[PDB]
């Protein structure tokens, strides 16, 4: 790639992100005074474990749907073979969601936007996975302290998704080329905006992996306890990405083949 080509890549990734960001930043900021009351938090804490799981799994899947669309619109992604598209989304979609989530996290009062209002960690007690929840809140706090712009989130999530180290890729060199061009774009944009200092402050790649592993591990516990709930009331796409041996569905293929 050349230098104008890199800045065109920057513009194209930012555009692809804006079209698929699910919620515009201002819509999340405008709701920050809308906080759950103590009575509403209590109501969430008294919901059954299985109903809170279903609701949370539903919201995760919705967010993952916008990530799939981001990929489909991401320069060079659809030129990868189908196998590698699926590999990359299977391993990276939850990671992208976790990074995007920091937009919905208010570091001032330690709350996250959830079902129309902002609430803290205690909102999720009924899940029985406090360690996973606090890890996500802590990760969202760490990213909020960097004050990502929307352009930086677009470029960083492109790189989270386009990761040539995922096991199972068939055209590893093609993914490497794509990853390298997106890295140049991200680092070029940081340099031009005098934001190279955040590079040392970004989370190690093992953190994002660790959060996704905790998620799958707590899901396995839940699915053992409530197997019919997962079968009857979890989104098919969710089960395909995270469940075992829930990889019996083929939703990703249909989502990618469409359009
Ligand atoms: C850390 C606490 N938390 C969760 C914890 C667990 C969980 O589910 C899995 C555990 C087992 C299933 C699910 C959530 C969960 C979901 C939401 C959510 O969807 N809010 C609505 C919203 C819409 C758009 C945006 S965005 O535009 O920024 C692009 C992402 C962000 C937010 C918020 C907090 C959550």
JSON list of N, CA and C and ligand atoms in Angstrom, two decimals, residues 17 20-25 28 52-64 66-67 94 96-105 112-117 119-121 123-124 127 129 132-137 140 150 153 215 218-219 222 234 238 242, ligand 1:
[
{"chain": "A", "resi": 17, "resn": "UNK", "atom": "N", "xyz": [-17.72, 1.45, 9.94]},
{"chain": "A", "resi": 17, "resn": "UNK", "atom": "CA", "xyz": [-18.09, 1.40, 11.35]},
{"chain": "A", "resi": 17, "resn": "UNK", "atom": "C", "xyz": [-19.31, 2.27, 11.63]},
{"chain": "A", "resi": 20, "resn": "UNK", "atom": "N", "xyz": [-22.68, 0.73, 10.98]},
{"chain": "A", "resi": 20, "resn": "UNK", "atom": "CA", "xyz": [-23.01, -0.50, 11.69]},
{"chain": "A", "resi": 20, "resn": "UNK", "atom": "C", "xyz": [-22.73, -0.37, 13.18]},
{"chain": "A", "resi": 21, "resn": "UNK", "atom": "N", "xyz": [-22.70, 0.85, 13.72]},
{"chain": "A", "resi": 21, "resn": "UNK", "atom": "CA", "xyz": [-22.32, 1.01, 15.12]},
{"chain": "A", "resi": 21, "resn": "UNK", "atom": "C", "xyz": [-23.45, 0.66, 16.09]},
{"chain": "A", "resi": 22, "resn": "UNK", "atom": "N", "xyz": [-24.62, 0.23, 15.59]},
{"chain": "A", "resi": 22, "resn": "UNK", "atom": "CA", "xyz": [-25.78, -0.14, 16.40]},
{"chain": "A", "resi": 22, "resn": "UNK", "atom": "C", "xyz": [-26.42, 1.09, 17.04]},
{"chain": "A", "resi": 23, "resn": "UNK", "atom": "N", "xyz": [-25.73, 1.75, 17.97]},
{"chain": "A", "resi": 23, "resn": "UNK", "atom": "CA", "xyz": [-26.20, 2.99, 18.57]},
{"chain": "A", "resi": 23, "resn": "UNK", "atom": "C", "xyz": [-25.16, 4.07, 18.34]},
{"chain": "A", "resi": 24, "resn": "UNK", "atom": "N", "xyz": [-25.60, 5.20, 17.79]},
{"chain": "A", "resi": 24, "resn": "UNK", "atom": "CA", "xyz": [-24.71, 6.34, 17.68]},
{"chain": "A", "resi": 24, "resn": "UNK", "atom": "C", "xyz": [-24.26, 6.79, 19.07]},
{"chain": "A", "resi": 25, "resn": "UNK", "atom": "N", "xyz": [-23.01, 7.24, 19.17]},
{"chain": "A", "resi": 25, "resn": "UNK", "atom": "CA", "xyz": [-22.46, 7.65, 20.46]},
{"chain": "A", "resi": 25, "resn": "UNK", "atom": "C", "xyz": [-23.37, 8.65, 21.18]},
{"chain": "A", "resi": 28, "resn": "UNK", "atom": "N", "xyz": [-26.21, 7.26, 23.16]},
{"chain": "A", "resi": 28, "resn": "UNK", "atom": "CA", "xyz": [-25.82, 6.70, 24.45]},
{"chain": "A", "resi": 28, "resn": "UNK", "atom": "C", "xyz": [-25.49, 7.79, 25.46]},
{"chain": "A", "resi": 52, "resn": "UNK", "atom": "N", "xyz": [-32.65, -13.96, 33.33]},
{"chain": "A", "resi": 52, "resn": "UNK", "atom": "CA", "xyz": [-31.61, -12.96, 33.11]},
{"chain": "A", "resi": 52, "resn": "UNK", "atom": "C", "xyz": [-30.61, -13.42, 32.06]},
{"chain": "A", "resi": 53, "resn": "UNK", "atom": "N", "xyz": [-30.22, -14.70, 32.09]},
{"chain": "A", "resi": 53, "resn": "UNK", "atom": "CA", "xyz": [-29.36, -15.26, 31.04]},
{"chain": "A", "resi": 53, "resn": "UNK", "atom": "C", "xyz": [-29.97, -15.08, 29.66]},
{"chain": "A", "resi": 54, "resn": "UNK", "atom": "N", "xyz": [-31.24, -15.47, 29.50]},
{"chain": "A", "resi": 54, "resn": "UNK", "atom": "CA", "xyz": [-31.91, -15.35, 28.21]},
{"chain": "A", "resi": 54, "resn": "UNK", "atom": "C", "xyz": [-31.91, -13.91, 27.72]},
{"chain": "A", "resi": 55, "resn": "UNK", "atom": "N", "xyz": [-32.29, -12.98, 28.59]},
{"chain": "A", "resi": 55, "resn": "UNK", "atom": "CA", "xyz": [-32.32, -11.58, 28.21]},
{"chain": "A", "resi": 55, "resn": "UNK", "atom": "C", "xyz": [-30.92, -11.07, 27.84]},
{"chain": "A", "resi": 56, "resn": "UNK", "atom": "N", "xyz": [-29.92, -11.38, 28.67]},
{"chain": "A", "resi": 56, "resn": "UNK", "atom": "CA", "xyz": [-28.57, -10.96, 28.34]},
{"chain": "A", "resi": 56, "resn": "UNK", "atom": "C", "xyz": [-28.07, -11.61, 27.05]},
{"chain": "A", "resi": 57, "resn": "UNK", "atom": "N", "xyz": [-28.29, -12.92, 26.89]},
{"chain": "A", "resi": 57, "resn": "UNK", "atom": "CA", "xyz": [-27.90, -13.56, 25.63]},
{"chain": "A", "resi": 57, "resn": "UNK", "atom": "C", "xyz": [-28.58, -12.91, 24.43]},
{"chain": "A", "resi": 58, "resn": "UNK", "atom": "N", "xyz": [-29.84, -12.51, 24.59]},
{"chain": "A", "resi": 58, "resn": "UNK", "atom": "CA", "xyz": [-30.54, -11.84, 23.50]},
{"chain": "A", "resi": 58, "resn": "UNK", "atom": "C", "xyz": [-29.88, -10.51, 23.15]},
{"chain": "A", "resi": 59, "resn": "UNK", "atom": "N", "xyz": [-29.54, -9.70, 24.15]},
{"chain": "A", "resi": 59, "resn": "UNK", "atom": "CA", "xyz": [-28.90, -8.42, 23.87]},
{"chain": "A", "resi": 59, "resn": "UNK", "atom": "C", "xyz": [-27.52, -8.60, 23.25]},
{"chain": "A", "resi": 60, "resn": "UNK", "atom": "N", "xyz": [-26.78, -9.62, 23.70]},
{"chain": "A", "resi": 60, "resn": "UNK", "atom": "CA", "xyz": [-25.48, -9.88, 23.10]},
{"chain": "A", "resi": 60, "resn": "UNK", "atom": "C", "xyz": [-25.62, -10.22, 21.64]},
{"chain": "A", "resi": 61, "resn": "UNK", "atom": "N", "xyz": [-26.60, -11.06, 21.31]},
{"chain": "A", "resi": 61, "resn": "UNK", "atom": "CA", "xyz": [-26.77, -11.49, 19.94]},
{"chain": "A", "resi": 61, "resn": "UNK", "atom": "C", "xyz": [-27.11, -10.33, 19.04]},
{"chain": "A", "resi": 62, "resn": "UNK", "atom": "N", "xyz": [-27.94, -9.40, 19.53]},
{"chain": "A", "resi": 62, "resn": "UNK", "atom": "CA", "xyz": [-28.28, -8.22, 18.75]},
{"chain": "A", "resi": 62, "resn": "UNK", "atom": "C", "xyz": [-27.03, -7.43, 18.41]},
{"chain": "A", "resi": 63, "resn": "UNK", "atom": "N", "xyz": [-26.17, -7.20, 19.42]},
{"chain": "A", "resi": 63, "resn": "UNK", "atom": "CA", "xyz": [-24.91, -6.51, 19.19]},
{"chain": "A", "resi": 63, "resn": "UNK", "atom": "C", "xyz": [-24.03, -7.28, 18.21]},
{"chain": "A", "resi": 64, "resn": "UNK", "atom": "N", "xyz": [-23.96, -8.61, 18.34]},
{"chain": "A", "resi": 64, "resn": "UNK", "atom": "CA", "xyz": [-23.18, -9.42, 17.42]},
{"chain": "A", "resi": 64, "resn": "UNK", "atom": "C", "xyz": [-23.69, -9.29, 15.99]},
{"chain": "A", "resi": 66, "resn": "UNK", "atom": "N", "xyz": [-24.82, -6.59, 14.56]},
{"chain": "A", "resi": 66, "resn": "UNK", "atom": "CA", "xyz": [-24.23, -5.41, 13.94]},
{"chain": "A", "resi": 66, "resn": "UNK", "atom": "C", "xyz": [-22.74, -5.61, 13.65]},
{"chain": "A", "resi": 67, "resn": "UNK", "atom": "N", "xyz": [-22.06, -6.44, 14.45]},
{"chain": "A", "resi": 67, "resn": "UNK", "atom": "CA", "xyz": [-20.66, -6.74, 14.18]},
{"chain": "A", "resi": 67, "resn": "UNK", "atom": "C", "xyz": [-20.51, -7.55, 12.89]},
{"chain": "A", "resi": 94, "resn": "UNK", "atom": "N", "xyz": [-17.46, -11.64, 19.55]},
{"chain": "A", "resi": 94, "resn": "UNK", "atom": "CA", "xyz": [-17.62, -11.31, 20.96]},
{"chain": "A", "resi": 94, "resn": "UNK", "atom": "C", "xyz": [-16.56, -10.30, 21.40]},
{"chain": "A", "resi": 96, "resn": "UNK", "atom": "N", "xyz": [-15.12, -7.98, 19.48]},
{"chain": "A", "resi": 96, "resn": "UNK", "atom": "CA", "xyz": [-15.52, -6.67, 18.98]},
{"chain": "A", "resi": 96, "resn": "UNK", "atom": "C", "xyz": [-16.62, -6.08, 19.86]},
{"chain": "A", "resi": 97, "resn": "UNK", "atom": "N", "xyz": [-17.65, -6.88, 20.17]},
{"chain": "A", "resi": 97, "resn": "UNK", "atom": "CA", "xyz": [-18.72, -6.41, 21.06]},
{"chain": "A", "resi": 97, "resn": "UNK", "atom": "C", "xyz": [-18.15, -5.87, 22.38]},
{"chain": "A", "resi": 98, "resn": "UNK", "atom": "N", "xyz": [-17.23, -6.62, 23.01]},
{"chain": "A", "resi": 98, "resn": "UNK", "atom": "CA", "xyz": [-16.69, -6.18, 24.29]},
{"chain": "A", "resi": 98, "resn": "UNK", "atom": "C", "xyz": [-15.97, -4.84, 24.17]},
{"chain": "A", "resi": 99, "resn": "UNK", "atom": "N", "xyz": [-15.30, -4.58, 23.04]},
{"chain": "A", "resi": 99, "resn": "UNK", "atom": "CA", "xyz": [-14.64, -3.29, 22.85]},
{"chain": "A", "resi": 99, "resn": "UNK", "atom": "C", "xyz": [-15.67, -2.18, 22.62]},
{"chain": "A", "resi": 100, "resn": "UNK", "atom": "N", "xyz": [-16.62, -2.41, 21.70]},
{"chain": "A", "resi": 100, "resn": "UNK", "atom": "CA", "xyz": [-17.70, -1.46, 21.46]},
{"chain": "A", "resi": 100, "resn": "UNK", "atom": "C", "xyz": [-18.46, -1.12, 22.74]},
{"chain": "A", "resi": 101, "resn": "UNK", "atom": "N", "xyz": [-18.58, -2.08, 23.66]},
{"chain": "A", "resi": 101, "resn": "UNK", "atom": "CA", "xyz": [-19.33, -1.88, 24.90]},
{"chain": "A", "resi": 101, "resn": "UNK", "atom": "C", "xyz": [-18.82, -0.69, 25.71]},
{"chain": "A", "resi": 102, "resn": "UNK", "atom": "N", "xyz": [-17.54, -0.32, 25.58]},
{"chain": "A", "resi": 102, "resn": "UNK", "atom": "CA", "xyz": [-17.04, 0.78, 26.41]},
{"chain": "A", "resi": 102, "resn": "UNK", "atom": "C", "xyz": [-17.73, 2.09, 26.07]},
{"chain": "A", "resi": 103, "resn": "UNK", "atom": "N", "xyz": [-18.33, 2.20, 24.88]},
{"chain": "A", "resi": 103, "resn": "UNK", "atom": "CA", "xyz": [-19.12, 3.38, 24.55]},
{"chain": "A", "resi": 103, "resn": "UNK", "atom": "C", "xyz": [-20.36, 3.50, 25.44]},
{"chain": "A", "resi": 104, "resn": "UNK", "atom": "N", "xyz": [-20.88, 2.38, 25.90]},
{"chain": "A", "resi": 104, "resn": "UNK", "atom": "CA", "xyz": [-22.11, 2.35, 26.68]},
{"chain": "A", "resi": 104, "resn": "UNK", "atom": "C", "xyz": [-21.82, 2.38, 28.16]},
{"chain": "A", "resi": 105, "resn": "UNK", "atom": "N", "xyz": [-20.55, 2.55, 28.52]},
{"chain": "A", "resi": 105, "resn": "UNK", "atom": "CA", "xyz": [-20.10, 2.55, 29.90]},
{"chain": "A", "resi": 105, "resn": "UNK", "atom": "C", "xyz": [-19.73, 3.97, 30.31]},
{"chain": "A", "resi": 112, "resn": "UNK", "atom": "N", "xyz": [-23.49, 1.07, 33.04]},
{"chain": "A", "resi": 112, "resn": "UNK", "atom": "CA", "xyz": [-23.55, 0.65, 31.64]},
{"chain": "A", "resi": 112, "resn": "UNK", "atom": "C", "xyz": [-25.00, 0.76, 31.18]},
{"chain": "A", "resi": 113, "resn": "UNK", "atom": "N", "xyz": [-25.18, 1.12, 29.90]},
{"chain": "A", "resi": 113, "resn": "UNK", "atom": "CA", "xyz": [-26.51, 1.21, 29.31]},
{"chain": "A", "resi": 113, "resn": "UNK", "atom": "C", "xyz": [-27.06, -0.19, 29.05]},
{"chain": "A", "resi": 114, "resn": "UNK", "atom": "N", "xyz": [-28.26, -0.46, 29.58]},
{"chain": "A", "resi": 114, "resn": "UNK", "atom": "CA", "xyz": [-28.83, -1.81, 29.52]},
{"chain": "A", "resi": 114, "resn": "UNK", "atom": "C", "xyz": [-30.35, -1.71, 29.60]},
{"chain": "A", "resi": 115, "resn": "UNK", "atom": "N", "xyz": [-31.03, -2.11, 28.53]},
{"chain": "A", "resi": 115, "resn": "UNK", "atom": "CA", "xyz": [-32.49, -2.08, 28.49]},
{"chain": "A", "resi": 115, "resn": "UNK", "atom": "C", "xyz": [-33.03, -0.70, 28.86]},
{"chain": "A", "resi": 116, "resn": "UNK", "atom": "N", "xyz": [-32.47, 0.33, 28.21]},
{"chain": "A", "resi": 116, "resn": "UNK", "atom": "CA", "xyz": [-33.03, 1.66, 28.26]},
{"chain": "A", "resi": 116, "resn": "UNK", "atom": "C", "xyz": [-32.52, 2.57, 29.37]},
{"chain": "A", "resi": 117, "resn": "UNK", "atom": "N", "xyz": [-31.75, 2.06, 30.33]},
{"chain": "A", "resi": 117, "resn": "UNK", "atom": "CA", "xyz": [-31.22, 2.91, 31.39]},
{"chain": "A", "resi": 117, "resn": "UNK", "atom": "C", "xyz": [-29.82, 2.44, 31.76]},
{"chain": "A", "resi": 119, "resn": "UNK", "atom": "N", "xyz": [-27.16, 1.25, 34.64]},
{"chain": "A", "resi": 119, "resn": "UNK", "atom": "CA", "xyz": [-27.08, 0.63, 35.94]},
{"chain": "A", "resi": 119, "resn": "UNK", "atom": "C", "xyz": [-25.69, 0.06, 36.13]},
{"chain": "A", "resi": 120, "resn": "UNK", "atom": "N", "xyz": [-25.35, -0.18, 37.40]},
{"chain": "A", "resi": 120, "resn": "UNK", "atom": "CA", "xyz": [-24.05, -0.69, 37.76]},
{"chain": "A", "resi": 120, "resn": "UNK", "atom": "C", "xyz": [-23.98, -2.21, 37.80]},
{"chain": "A", "resi": 121, "resn": "UNK", "atom": "N", "xyz": [-22.82, -2.70, 38.23]},
{"chain": "A", "resi": 121, "resn": "UNK", "atom": "CA", "xyz": [-22.54, -4.13, 38.33]},
{"chain": "A", "resi": 121, "resn": "UNK", "atom": "C", "xyz": [-23.66, -4.88, 39.04]},
{"chain": "A", "resi": 123, "resn": "UNK", "atom": "N", "xyz": [-26.65, -4.75, 38.94]},
{"chain": "A", "resi": 123, "resn": "UNK", "atom": "CA", "xyz": [-27.79, -5.08, 38.11]},
{"chain": "A", "resi": 123, "resn": "UNK", "atom": "C", "xyz": [-27.77, -6.55, 37.67]},
{"chain": "A", "resi": 124, "resn": "UNK", "atom": "N", "xyz": [-26.58, -7.16, 37.58]},
{"chain": "A", "resi": 124, "resn": "UNK", "atom": "CA", "xyz": [-26.39, -8.46, 36.94]},
{"chain": "A", "resi": 124, "resn": "UNK", "atom": "C", "xyz": [-26.21, -9.61, 37.92]},
{"chain": "A", "resi": 127, "resn": "UNK", "atom": "N", "xyz": [-27.30, -13.35, 37.44]},
{"chain": "A", "resi": 127, "resn": "UNK", "atom": "CA", "xyz": [-26.61, -14.24, 36.51]},
{"chain": "A", "resi": 127, "resn": "UNK", "atom": "C", "xyz": [-25.77, -15.28, 37.23]},
{"chain": "A", "resi": 129, "resn": "UNK", "atom": "N", "xyz": [-22.51, -14.92, 37.78]},
{"chain": "A", "resi": 129, "resn": "UNK", "atom": "CA", "xyz": [-21.16, -14.93, 37.23]},
{"chain": "A", "resi": 129, "resn": "UNK", "atom": "C", "xyz": [-20.51, -13.57, 37.50]},
{"chain": "A", "resi": 132, "resn": "UNK", "atom": "N", "xyz": [-16.99, -12.76, 35.83]},
{"chain": "A", "resi": 132, "resn": "UNK", "atom": "CA", "xyz": [-17.13, -12.31, 34.44]},
{"chain": "A", "resi": 132, "resn": "UNK", "atom": "C", "xyz": [-17.67, -10.88, 34.36]},
{"chain": "A", "resi": 133, "resn": "UNK", "atom": "N", "xyz": [-18.70, -10.56, 35.16]},
{"chain": "A", "resi": 133, "resn": "UNK", "atom": "CA", "xyz": [-19.30, -9.23, 35.06]},
{"chain": "A", "resi": 133, "resn": "UNK", "atom": "C", "xyz": [-18.29, -8.15, 35.46]},
{"chain": "A", "resi": 134, "resn": "UNK", "atom": "N", "xyz": [-17.62, -8.33, 36.61]},
{"chain": "A", "resi": 134, "resn": "UNK", "atom": "CA", "xyz": [-16.65, -7.32, 37.05]},
{"chain": "A", "resi": 134, "resn": "UNK", "atom": "C", "xyz": [-15.46, -7.23, 36.08]},
{"chain": "A", "resi": 135, "resn": "UNK", "atom": "N", "xyz": [-15.03, -8.36, 35.51]},
{"chain": "A", "resi": 135, "resn": "UNK", "atom": "CA", "xyz": [-13.99, -8.28, 34.48]},
{"chain": "A", "resi": 135, "resn": "UNK", "atom": "C", "xyz": [-14.43, -7.38, 33.33]},
{"chain": "A", "resi": 136, "resn": "UNK", "atom": "N", "xyz": [-15.68, -7.53, 32.87]},
{"chain": "A", "resi": 136, "resn": "UNK", "atom": "CA", "xyz": [-16.15, -6.71, 31.75]},
{"chain": "A", "resi": 136, "resn": "UNK", "atom": "C", "xyz": [-16.26, -5.24, 32.16]},
{"chain": "A", "resi": 137, "resn": "UNK", "atom": "N", "xyz": [-16.81, -4.97, 33.34]},
{"chain": "A", "resi": 137, "resn": "UNK", "atom": "CA", "xyz": [-16.82, -3.61, 33.85]},
{"chain": "A", "resi": 137, "resn": "UNK", "atom": "C", "xyz": [-15.41, -3.03, 33.97]},
{"chain": "A", "resi": 140, "resn": "UNK", "atom": "N", "xyz": [-14.13, -2.31, 30.46]},
{"chain": "A", "resi": 140, "resn": "UNK", "atom": "CA", "xyz": [-14.79, -1.11, 29.96]},
{"chain": "A", "resi": 140, "resn": "UNK", "atom": "C", "xyz": [-14.25, 0.13, 30.65]},
{"chain": "A", "resi": 150, "resn": "UNK", "atom": "N", "xyz": [-14.59, 7.88, 18.04]},
{"chain": "A", "resi": 150, "resn": "UNK", "atom": "CA", "xyz": [-15.32, 6.89, 17.25]},
{"chain": "A", "resi": 150, "resn": "UNK", "atom": "C", "xyz": [-14.45, 6.35, 16.13]},
{"chain": "A", "resi": 153, "resn": "UNK", "atom": "N", "xyz": [-12.15, 3.73, 17.69]},
{"chain": "A", "resi": 153, "resn": "UNK", "atom": "CA", "xyz": [-12.87, 2.48, 17.94]},
{"chain": "A", "resi": 153, "resn": "UNK", "atom": "C", "xyz": [-13.09, 1.71, 16.65]},
{"chain": "A", "resi": 215, "resn": "UNK", "atom": "N", "xyz": [-16.65, -16.13, 29.40]},
{"chain": "A", "resi": 215, "resn": "UNK", "atom": "CA", "xyz": [-18.02, -16.19, 28.90]},
{"chain": "A", "resi": 215, "resn": "UNK", "atom": "C", "xyz": [-18.39, -17.61, 28.50]},
{"chain": "A", "resi": 218, "resn": "UNK", "atom": "N", "xyz": [-18.74, -19.84, 31.65]},
{"chain": "A", "resi": 218, "resn": "UNK", "atom": "CA", "xyz": [-19.94, -19.68, 32.46]},
{"chain": "A", "resi": 218, "resn": "UNK", "atom": "C", "xyz": [-21.17, -20.19, 31.71]},
{"chain": "A", "resi": 219, "resn": "UNK", "atom": "N", "xyz": [-21.18, -20.05, 30.38]},
{"chain": "A", "resi": 219, "resn": "UNK", "atom": "CA", "xyz": [-22.27, -20.60, 29.59]},
{"chain": "A", "resi": 219, "resn": "UNK", "atom": "C", "xyz": [-22.35, -22.12, 29.73]},
{"chain": "A", "resi": 222, "resn": "UNK", "atom": "N", "xyz": [-24.06, -22.84, 32.92]},
{"chain": "A", "resi": 222, "resn": "UNK", "atom": "CA", "xyz": [-25.49, -22.55, 32.82]},
{"chain": "A", "resi": 222, "resn": "UNK", "atom": "C", "xyz": [-26.21, -23.59, 31.98]},
{"chain": "A", "resi": 234, "resn": "UNK", "atom": "N", "xyz": [-32.68, -19.60, 23.78]},
{"chain": "A", "resi": 234, "resn": "UNK", "atom": "CA", "xyz": [-31.54, -18.79, 23.41]},
{"chain": "A", "resi": 234, "resn": "UNK", "atom": "C", "xyz": [-31.51, -18.55, 21.90]},
{"chain": "A", "resi": 238, "resn": "UNK", "atom": "N", "xyz": [-26.48, -17.09, 18.81]},
{"chain": "A", "resi": 238, "resn": "UNK", "atom": "CA", "xyz": [-25.73, -17.21, 20.05]},
{"chain": "A", "resi": 238, "resn": "UNK", "atom": "C", "xyz": [-25.25, -18.64, 20.28]},
{"chain": "A", "resi": 242, "resn": "UNK", "atom": "N", "xyz": [-21.23, -19.84, 20.62]},
{"chain": "A", "resi": 242, "resn": "UNK", "atom": "CA", "xyz": [-20.71, -20.06, 21.97]},
{"chain": "A", "resi": 242, "resn": "UNK", "atom": "C", "xyz": [-21.08, -21.40, 22.58]},
{"chain": "B", "resi": 1, "resn": "LIG", "atom": "C1", "xyz": [-21.40, -5.89, 31.25]},
{"chain": "B", "resi": 1, "resn": "LIG", "atom": "C2", "xyz": [-22.88, -6.04, 31.57]},
{"chain": "B", "resi": 1, "resn": "LIG", "atom": "N1", "xyz": [-23.60, -6.56, 30.42]},
{"chain": "B", "resi": 1, "resn": "LIG", "atom": "C3", "xyz": [-23.74, -7.88, 30.13]},
{"chain": "B", "resi": 1, "resn": "LIG", "atom": "C4", "xyz": [-23.28, -9.06, 30.77]},
{"chain": "B", "resi": 1, "resn": "LIG", "atom": "C5", "xyz": [-23.58, -10.31, 30.26]},
{"chain": "B", "resi": 1, "resn": "LIG", "atom": "C6", "xyz": [-24.32, -10.42, 29.07]},
{"chain": "B", "resi": 1, "resn": "LIG", "atom": "O1", "xyz": [-24.72, -11.62, 28.47]},
{"chain": "B", "resi": 1, "resn": "LIG", "atom": "C7", "xyz": [-23.93, -12.77, 28.51]},
{"chain": "B", "resi": 1, "resn": "LIG", "atom": "C8", "xyz": [-23.47, -13.32, 29.87]},
{"chain": "B", "resi": 1, "resn": "LIG", "atom": "C9", "xyz": [-24.24, -14.61, 29.61]},
{"chain": "B", "resi": 1, "resn": "LIG", "atom": "C10", "xyz": [-24.89, -13.97, 28.39]},
{"chain": "B", "resi": 1, "resn": "LIG", "atom": "C11", "xyz": [-24.78, -9.27, 28.45]},
{"chain": "B", "resi": 1, "resn": "LIG", "atom": "C12", "xyz": [-24.49, -8.00, 28.98]},
{"chain": "B", "resi": 1, "resn": "LIG", "atom": "C13", "xyz": [-24.81, -6.65, 28.56]},
{"chain": "B", "resi": 1, "resn": "LIG", "atom": "C14", "xyz": [-25.54, -6.13, 27.47]},
{"chain": "B", "resi": 1, "resn": "LIG", "atom": "C15", "xyz": [-25.69, -4.76, 27.33]},
{"chain": "B", "resi": 1, "resn": "LIG", "atom": "C16", "xyz": [-26.46, -4.20, 26.15]},
{"chain": "B", "resi": 1, "resn": "LIG", "atom": "O2", "xyz": [-26.69, -4.88, 25.21]},
{"chain": "B", "resi": 1, "resn": "LIG", "atom": "N2", "xyz": [-26.92, -2.83, 26.24]},
{"chain": "B", "resi": 1, "resn": "LIG", "atom": "C17", "xyz": [-27.62, -2.20, 25.14]},
{"chain": "B", "resi": 1, "resn": "LIG", "atom": "C18", "xyz": [-26.54, -1.67, 24.20]},
{"chain": "B", "resi": 1, "resn": "LIG", "atom": "C19", "xyz": [-26.83, -1.36, 22.88]},
{"chain": "B", "resi": 1, "resn": "LIG", "atom": "C20", "xyz": [-25.84, -0.90, 22.04]},
{"chain": "B", "resi": 1, "resn": "LIG", "atom": "C21", "xyz": [-24.54, -0.75, 22.52]},
{"chain": "B", "resi": 1, "resn": "LIG", "atom": "S1", "xyz": [-23.23, -0.14, 21.41]},
{"chain": "B", "resi": 1, "resn": "LIG", "atom": "O3", "xyz": [-23.86, 0.77, 20.42]},
{"chain": "B", "resi": 1, "resn": "LIG", "atom": "O4", "xyz": [-22.23, 0.60, 22.13]},
{"chain": "B", "resi": 1, "resn": "LIG", "atom": "C22", "xyz": [-22.46, -1.57, 20.57]},
{"chain": "B", "resi": 1, "resn": "LIG", "atom": "C23", "xyz": [-22.19, -2.70, 21.58]},
{"chain": "B", "resi": 1, "resn": "LIG", "atom": "C24", "xyz": [-24.23, -1.05, 23.83]},
{"chain": "B", "resi": 1, "resn": "LIG", "atom": "C25", "xyz": [-25.23, -1.51, 24.68]},
{"chain": "B", "resi": 1, "resn": "LIG", "atom": "C26", "xyz": [-25.09, -3.89, 28.26]},
{"chain": "B", "resi": 1, "resn": "LIG", "atom": "C27", "xyz": [-24.38, -4.40, 29.34]},
{"chain": "B", "resi": 1, "resn": "LIG", "atom": "C28", "xyz": [-24.24, -5.81, 29.48]}
]
